[PDB]
Design a protein around this nucleic acid. Structure first.
Lengths: 245, 245
DNA sequence: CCCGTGAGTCCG
DNA sequence: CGGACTACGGG
């Protein structure tokens, strides 16, 4: 029937476990847009997760100008507002670094990764209902981390102690999400997410295939030479273009 | 028109924004004399801000025995009581460091910076009404900060993240203050206020010139000999001695 | 207090 | 490998 409500419950219980973790060392700021940007996030799930899915795209964690602002995965402001047509009130984290303030849908910066991601599907699928008929998008981890100067820290940059515990907790929620959605294929966006999903799903004995595509980050020089062209070819090879229409 | 009421409204708006800030790290104590010494401050503004001004002298923030006690900029107790003839009730900060309790007009210590500053204008102008005809005095930031041992931390001493948050808020209040007072010349007292004011006011394109004089602090080795003589020379060069007499 | 030296970060 | 921007100790 509709996985939306259960998906949101997975996420709220995940938030509960993450709220009791204590980060140290180089980590000096932690944001969770599933707290302060819950409203647009809930709107995204209720609008686009009304039925069981064939394919899940999985990213690592929010980027600073995307999901950190909008609550939506790969959630670059223009594409979220104008194509996905998702809105909602956004408040702020308890402790903000001044170079990484949350302005929500008034953030003037584009998250390049997110702009690339949604531009691909806007071009391929035309309308959002066409993409979400059989697909969904989610991140392994909802937290974003920064050091003293506001520089982003990936989950892999974290001290080994906190890193392993964080990711194990996230593995467990990912497994629940995969089952709630009923997906037969998980596509990891980037190597970290592809490899982490394969490992997490194997550790709980779920027989869902896991593949990957190239991540759109402009820190990847390959992605700056024609990301969209590369990933169209990769999606053709995975045999999912018919689902995407 | 008198800008006094408009100026006080700018300060009250600033206090509201500052009251929501949370400091940490080496900051252990934060006093705002525009809360606990609002009465003498409002007396100061209502008495000496009765018309628009040509010149604004701008300090950085309060010193522990001056404005932190009296609520008046560069507000050394004797010169505030005897030359400015400003008094009023002073309460206390919510949490005091035991070596920096607020005694208000009973504070027995002299703030050297403030004594130097107001003694200069007492000698030059004679009566305060002569000084304030075309001039006014204000600080960029009304807060004073102490570490665990009660040592003063200037805004420059704060960690970058805390400093940037605070000073962006103060910059915007400064633009508003300059507008309501009609000031054509801001004189930064010290290089920090001069440079900060120039950047803030040029960013908003305010029609105002920014210059500087030497800071009178005893921590400034250049001020140890002949501060008054040096600054008289600087004031002469800035063209303001005619307005001040 | 002011400056001179210099290290963290960005170059999507 | 360069160039610009912007913590802290001595004076």
């Amino acid at each position: 029937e509709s996985p939306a409500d259960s998906f949101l419950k997975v996420e709220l219980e995940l938030n509960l476990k993450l709220s009791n973790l204590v980060f140290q060392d180089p980590v000096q700021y932690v944001y969770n847009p599933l707290v302060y940007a819950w409203a647009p996030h809930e709107n995204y799930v209720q609008t686009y997760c009304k039925s069981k899915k064939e394919v899940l795209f999985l990213g690592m964690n929010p980027g600073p100008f995307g999901m950190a602002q909008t609550g939506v995965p790969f959630g670059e402001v223009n594409h979220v507002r104008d194509w996905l047509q998702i809105e909602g009130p956004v408040s702020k984290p308890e402790v903000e670094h001044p170079k990484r303030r949350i302005r929500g849908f008034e953030c003037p910066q584009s998250e390049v990764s997110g702009a690339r991601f949604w531009s691909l599907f806007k071009s391929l699928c035309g309308q959002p209902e066409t993409f979400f008929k059989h697909c969904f998008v989610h991140n392994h981890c909802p937290l974003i981390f920064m050091n003293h100067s506001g520089k982003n820290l990936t989950p892999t940059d974290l001290p080994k102690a906190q890193r392993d515990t964080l990711l194990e907790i996230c593995d467990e929620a990912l497994c629940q999400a995969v089952r709630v959605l009923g997906v037969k294929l998980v596509i990891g966006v980037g190597r970290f997410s592809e490899q982490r999903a394969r490992k997490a799903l194997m550790a709980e004995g779920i027989d869902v295939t896991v593949k990957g595509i190239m991540h759109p980050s402009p820190r990847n020089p390959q992605a700056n030479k024609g990301w969209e062209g590369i990933v169209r070819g990769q999606l053709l090879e995975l045999g999912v273009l018919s689902l995407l229409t």
